[PDB]
Design a protein around this ligand. Structure first.
Ligand code: Q63
Lengths: 412, 412
């Protein structure tokens, strides 16, 4: 048997806002967070826009001295984690600190720092590399700094599964609680890949939208005029907690995490199979883990990246899994508004799936002006749809054919 | 209910050899794999040596066409993975491919490829970044490419917990099998951080030995004249398999994986506490997980990095956990010969711990000429020690205060 896992705290930085409620207000209003990237000469690049975090003040979280040691993606992950722990109301004590851990991940980690230290090495040589370069750029330092700051002695680790990172981080933290290795975990992901190397790396693969003239219309999942993903920055963190632990302290419970699925496509390094076979196995595994029939699903937060092959693969997977229920559920891509936060995508989308359950509303897929061939599901085009949602799924698909699915249920 | 996990296949690249048996022959002979680095001009660097893989032929494993796209850390992790799968004798079929997964991690991933693309960006422009830059550098692509080449459709992920990565990867993969999420996992880690950014970055932190004039004597764990770690490259992979699955197919079983522990120090971003409290908590978790009397432990493969603070913290932790039995067990650091493979250290050292069980021999700590104050255990100084080993423990400790311990025992 297995313990039950609930969500008692959430925290976020996104292109829509510097916390959860601001971001969520943007989501339900159909607002875009996408804009031309500032303070960077992107003349030579084929994409000049993305989803930046606007107005982030690290000194709300860290001293200027500790902030100078840490890449932006670590700053973002710590901001989301501190927000989530504050939101949970949890009091860390000597009686519980060995039972509270962290799994905050990243797909790409400290590209900005790597770029800046490369500049020093190439121009001046290795004596200009920062002493804090390695520990301030490695992906496990959100988990590391968080544990140090709050005195958390439970399982401490970090996943890096590309665009699936935030989903796998949350799912595996839920397993740690369900199987009694922890009572509380802070889990999610963070990303800041808007450097030359990030825009340039994805651009070299021709993976990005190049709709420079209308950045807010670039991210258009399932639209016939889509031309690749939009790169975005930010973080999401959830406090996962064992149910009896949450009830005993009078925690506010947002939702229950009832299932987690993983699978591998074993197909291609960057493209999914056209029929979404791996995404179908992953969703079936998550529903089996939850003891739910596909017909019980009400809302899917799609991966929905705005790539030709990815968006159509997801439609095929959902039709395969859900059969005569495939049109009854609502499925939307919040990446239509946020762009693609890579390893933080699954974290901010798990939060949006939990809020869909709290507020009984499916967020819109904006920009879905002309659904592509076979994209005939309820994709919540243009505007939020109030509806009944008892069960919400969140999907992530990543490079290497790595798949994750989370299943959330209303808690009463 | 929780299933038993055994080791059926192993594979390795190390500074001592291009496979497991050649590496283990070096270990038992007390041979150093450390030498001046040949691949680059390090005259401006404070450290000019390390543990390189010598004479690696990627065309024993991969087409030159595909090898050209992949960072060395991916090539190394695929080589070790292919070895381990072949060594296991497992045949991947439609009947079992959904039950076989992979968790190969890395501390730093494709830093050489990142540095080379950064050089292209800065000297030429973004149009010269490789289209393969992202999928050929990101940490999850050992798991991804292995899954694509062998058709593994089970859990597909990667950990990044700095110098703890390989141990965490093996333990979490064993929990996947224990809890029924998979029947087989390939797990371990790979690292190739020996580029200017890596040698420069660890150099800037003054973390590295600077014994340039005597490289084979630089790594000297618990020796009074130690002056930091030696950076080394390579990979370890193990095939983990559920016990009844292994028995059913008549697999050769090397040993049983009976315990796994994790803990966070919550102390310091890079420094271990002097008393080794987090390391002690981690070992105690692992011993309780394995259902053991601590007096059953016969052999410990230490982390043993050859840092002043790390080596003495590990003596303090072993004394705290084992009491008077601390004087009966044997403990050695194989990093005395291999150097520190960072995220691959825990993977190669898990393999050495399994072979200590197979061959009933404690590998030596070479270079231990003058044990430091309080370093008065059996540290197997200079020469391999044949002895009874029923239970072997492998420890790792990393940046962020992240700790892992694996417990292996003989299987009859
Ligand atoms: C392009 C993909 O880059 C990454 O994933 C980087 F973050 C790099 O792997 C890294 C550098 C350091 C130090 O730690 N990790």
């Amino acid at each position: 048997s297995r313990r039950r896992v609930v969500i008692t705290g959430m925290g976020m930085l996104s292109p829509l806002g510097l916390d959860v409620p601001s971001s969520w207000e943007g989501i339900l209003a159909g607002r875009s967070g996408i804009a031309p990237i500032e303070h960077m000469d992107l003349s030579a690049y084929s994409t000049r826009f993305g989803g930046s975090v606007k107005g982030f003040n690290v000194e709300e979280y860290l001293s200027a001295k500790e902030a100078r040691k840490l890449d932006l993606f670590i700053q973002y992950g710590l901001a989301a984690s501190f927000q989530a722990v504050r939101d949970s109301g949890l009091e860390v004590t000597d009686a519980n600190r060995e039972r509270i851990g962290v799994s905050m991940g990243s797909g790409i980690g400290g590209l900005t720092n790597i770029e800046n230290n490369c500049r020093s090495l190439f121009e001046q040589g290795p004596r200009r590399i920062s002493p804090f370069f390695v520990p301030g750029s490695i992906i496990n330092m959100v988990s590391g700094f968080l544990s140090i700051h709050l005195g958390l002695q439970g399982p401490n680790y970090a996943l890096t599964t590309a665009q699936t990172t935030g989903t796998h981080s949350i799912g595996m933290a839920a397993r740690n609680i369900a199987y009694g290795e922890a009572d509380v975990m802070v889990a999610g992901g963070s990303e800041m890949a808007a450097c030359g190397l990030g825009l340039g790396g994805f651009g070299a693969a021709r993976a990005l939208s190049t709709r420079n003239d209308e950045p807010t219309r670039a991210s258009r999942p399932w639209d016939r005029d889509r031309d690749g993903f939009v790169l975005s920055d930010g973080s999401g963190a959830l406090v996962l907690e064992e149910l009896e632990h949450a009830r005993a302290r009078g925690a506010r419970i947002y939702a229950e995490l009832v299932g987690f699925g993983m699978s591998g496509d074993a197909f291609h390094m960057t493209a999914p199979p056209e029929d979404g076979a791996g995404a179908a196995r992953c969703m079936k595994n998550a529903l089996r883990d939850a003891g739910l029939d596909p017909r019980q699903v009400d809302y899917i937060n799609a991966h929905g990246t705005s790539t030709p092959a990815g968006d159509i693969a997801e439609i095929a997977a959902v039709k395969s899994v859900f059969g005569e229920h495939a049109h009854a559920l609502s499925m939307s891509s919040t990446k239509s508004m946020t762009g693609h936060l890579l390893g933080a995508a699954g974290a901010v989308e798990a939060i949006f799936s939990v809020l869909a359950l709290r507020d009984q509303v499916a967020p819109p897929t904006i920009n879905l002006d002309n659904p592509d061939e076979g994209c005939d599901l309820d994709l919540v085009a243009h505007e939020a749809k109030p509806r009944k949602i008892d069960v919400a799924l969140s999907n992530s698909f990543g490079f290497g054919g790595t798949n994750g699915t989370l299943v959330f249920r209303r808690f009463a």
